Amino acid sequence: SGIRDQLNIIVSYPPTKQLTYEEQDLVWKFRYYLTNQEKALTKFLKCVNWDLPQEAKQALELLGKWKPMDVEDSLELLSSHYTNPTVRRYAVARLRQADDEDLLMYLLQLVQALKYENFDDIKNGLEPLEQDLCTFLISRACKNSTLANYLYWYVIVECEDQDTQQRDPKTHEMYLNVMRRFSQALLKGDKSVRVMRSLLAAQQTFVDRLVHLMKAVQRESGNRKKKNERLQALLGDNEKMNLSDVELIPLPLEPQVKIRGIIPETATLFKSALMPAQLFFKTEDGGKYPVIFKHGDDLRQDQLILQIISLMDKLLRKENLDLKLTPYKVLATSTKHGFMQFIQSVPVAEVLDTEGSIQNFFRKYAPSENGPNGISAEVMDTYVKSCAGYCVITYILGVGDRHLDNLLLTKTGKLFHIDFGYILGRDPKPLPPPMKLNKEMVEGMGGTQSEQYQEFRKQCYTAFLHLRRYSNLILNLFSLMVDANIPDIALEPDKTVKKVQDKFRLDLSDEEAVHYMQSLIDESVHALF
Numbered sequence: 199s200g201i202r203d204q205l206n207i208i209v210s211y212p213p214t215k216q217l218t219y220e221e222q223d224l225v226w227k228f229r230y231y232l233t234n235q236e237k238a239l240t241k242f243l244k245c246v247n248w249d250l251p252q253e254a255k256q257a258l259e260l261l262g263k264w265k266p267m268d269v270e271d272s273l274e275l276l277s278s279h280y281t282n283p284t285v286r287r288y289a290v291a292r293l294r295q296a297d298d299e300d301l302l303m304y305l306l307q308l309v310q311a312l313k314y315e316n317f318d319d320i321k322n323g324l325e326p327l328e329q330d331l332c333t334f335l336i337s338r339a340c341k342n343s344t345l346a347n348y349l350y351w352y353v354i355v356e357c358e359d360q361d362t363q364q365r366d367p368k369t370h371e372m373y374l375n376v377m378r379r380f381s382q383a384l385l386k387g388d389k390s391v392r393v394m395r396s397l398l399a400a401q402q403t404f405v406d407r408l409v410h411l412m413k414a415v416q417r418e419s420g421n422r423k424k425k426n427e428r429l430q431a432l433l434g435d436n437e438k439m440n441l442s443d444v445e446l447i448p449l450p451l452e453p454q455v456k457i458r459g460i461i462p463e464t465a466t467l468f469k470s471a472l473m474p475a476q477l478f479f480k481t482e483d484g485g486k487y488p489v490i491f492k493h494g495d496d497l498r499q500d501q502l503i504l505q506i507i508s509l510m511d512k513l514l515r516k517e518n519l520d521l522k523l524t525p526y527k528v529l530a531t532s533t534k535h536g537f538m539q540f541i542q543s544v545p546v547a548e549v550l551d552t553e554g555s556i557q558n559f560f561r562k563y564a565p566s567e568n569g570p571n572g573i574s575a576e577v578m579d580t581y582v583k584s585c586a587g588y589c590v591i592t593y594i595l596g597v598g599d600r601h602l603d604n605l606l607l608t609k610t611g612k613l614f615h616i617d618f619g620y621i622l623g624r625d626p627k628p629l630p631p632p633m634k635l636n637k638e639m640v641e642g643m644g645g646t647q648s649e650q651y652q653e654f655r656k657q658c659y660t661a662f663l664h665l666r667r668y669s670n671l672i673l674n675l676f677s678l679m680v681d682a683n684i685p686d687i688a689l690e691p692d693k694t695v696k697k698v699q700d701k702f703r704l705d706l707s708d709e710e711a712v713h714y715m716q717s718l719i720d721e722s723v724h725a726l727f
């Protein structure tokens with residue numbers, strides 16, 4: 199039997215690779231032989247004409263007898279492609295074997311995946327073991343405060359979405375029903391479950407008041423110094439604003455952190471057009487949590503990229519590879535405003551302007567005599583690792599608008615990227631390089647002939663080989679985002695996944711891919727001359 203060779207190629211395919219008429223009839227011919235292969239069920243379900251009552255009936259029979267698929271593959275079954283109630287329930291049942299830690303990593307996409315669900319089932323669950331996506335998400339949210347906090351904010355922003363409201367009123371109403379269903383489930387739950395609902399309410403009003411505070415500061419006609427004094431004044435008045443002192447509510451940005459209020463004196467506005475605020479949150483244990491509060495911007499694209507960077511960091515750490523990345527938290531509280539976790543760092547542009555180079559900066563704040571080029575071995579290892587991680591991650595996500603004001607550096611050697619306005623190949627200038635690696639980074643690791651540069655390339659291959667192994671999960675997650683109001687996705691929804699897939703070079707073998715990665719680093723470093 200030599201047919202199993204061509205058959206195994208079809209099974210190993212990416213989730214978004216369309217099966218040809220020939221491949222389709224080959225999978226449908228050998229269905230029963232494939233019931234022992236789990237990664238095959240995925241390929242089997244896309245051969246079925248679900249509009250044919252006889253064909254669907256036999257397929258649902260095979261589903262039952264089939265070796266259950268991994269959580270990662272069940273995500274495909276929740277995309278717009280499947281409408282079969284039984285296939286969608288099967289996906290929920292497989293997603294259920296995953297723990298809350300993995301579930302949270304997928305929550306952003308699953309809230310999107312609700313627009314592919316039965317809208318009538320969602321509405322009818324409202325008061326006048328085999329759950330749908332809505333029922334499952336609420337079920338898990340009632341048992342986990344962290345899960346419930348993100349479910350609240352991810353859904354509220356979709357309700358608030360005015361573009362969805364006018365261009366698709368059916369979808370907007372479904373999300374209001376998802377919110378109503380969640381609120382209903384919380385009020386019907388235990389003593390612990392019912393307090394969760396008032397905590398979400400408290401956070402909502404805190405955000406509402408914080409929004410109002412931002413608008414009140416702009417009433418002050420004066421300069422930034424006068425605007426800052428205005429911000430600090432209003433923040434001190436807890437009778438009026440009620441933001442310096444509040445009952446310990448979870449921080450929307452990181453719900454595991456409970457807060458007492460915002461320190462009024464250390465609160466300032468950033469020198470930028472939209473003037474976002476830098477706010478220090480008093481935690482329950484007397485600590486400080488710096489946040490950026492942005493009003494007049496849609497953080498949903500940055501929220502998606504940072505959620506993917508977080509997943510890629512977790513996947514790499516799981517493979518015993520800590521590339522010292524900065525997956526800072528981003529939570530959108532509206533389509534008009536949101537939070538970002540503040541990381542203490544210096545933009546690479548300010549590094550050059552004040553110290554001349556990265557290596558000078560490193561020598562100033564972290565010197566070591568026997569260390570490479572007079573810099574600490576720990577700081578240098580951190581920098582080489584982070585450069586590598588970000589080089590591969592930005593390449594995969596096709597991050598544009600890379601300039602030295604949105605490349606940040608820490609004194610501990612951590613290098614990270616911010617502001618993901620241009621993603622999936624888009625850039626302000628035409629013909630962008632596929633590898634975003636500038637001369638400043640190369641010079642920081644001691645030039646193209648250093649041992650650090652060789653380690654950097656090595657780390658790049660490792661990271662690229664590890665992330666390619668997780669392409670199925672990443673591509674499934676991006677596939678659930680196709681119809682989301684994410685600017686760089688909404689431009690070409692139908693072409694989005696393919697833009698990510700091509701970066702993996704899944705056509706090449708592990709050895710060929712390392713060759714491609716080493717040449718791509720070569721050609722980009724070459725172009726810098």
Ligand SMILES: Nc1ncc(-c2ccnc(Nc3ccncc3)n2)c(CC2CC2)n1
Binds near residue numbers: 468470474
């Ligand atoms: N769009 C955007 N995306 C991310 C960040 C961000 C996120 C996390 N940490 C930091 N840190 C710094 C940044 C600039 N200078 C020092 C630290 N910045 C920022 C910078 C804030 C001025 C608005 N903007």
